[PDB]
């Protein structure tokens, strides 16, 4: 069950090294980037799986509003409405534990 996040890391590393705007907006690279970030956001929104939540959070929590964080917060809303309370608490504990800039993780 750990192979999932292994390959997640091994793939997403080859996409967003530093920013999302390092590849110019409105360009094929940027366009595919917005496509894939939407794909993860929705698939996870349905899934409500933690590890994906963190991964997309820290990659989001590098540059302020570079990966369309309105979708990010909306995904939080549609997740926190769904799911069992214990599942939500598990996600919250995981994203709390990932806390240990470094600040911006929880902040956003």
């Amino acid at each position: 069950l750990e192979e999932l996040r292994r390959v997640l890391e091994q793939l997403i590393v080859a996409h967003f090294p530093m920013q999302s705007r390092e590849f110019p907006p409105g360009t094929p690279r940027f366009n595919n980037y917005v496509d894939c970030m939407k794909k993860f956001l929705d698939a996870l929104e349905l899934s409500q799986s933690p590890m994906l939540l963190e991964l997309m959070t820290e990659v989001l929590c590098r540059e302020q509003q570079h990966v369309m964080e309105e979708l990010f917060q909306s995904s939080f809303r549609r997740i926190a409405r769904r799911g069992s309370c214990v599942t939500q608490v598990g996600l919250l504990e995981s994203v709390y534990e990932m806390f240990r800039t470094r600040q911006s993780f929880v902040d956003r």
Partner: peptide, 18 residues
């Protein structure tokens, strides 16, 4: 990914490329 960018950059215009 921009690793390849500068790798091809420094030998596509043959400059030290600070």
């Amino acid at each position: 990914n921009p690793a390849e960018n500068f790798r091809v950059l420094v030998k596509q215009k043959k400059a030290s490329f600070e």
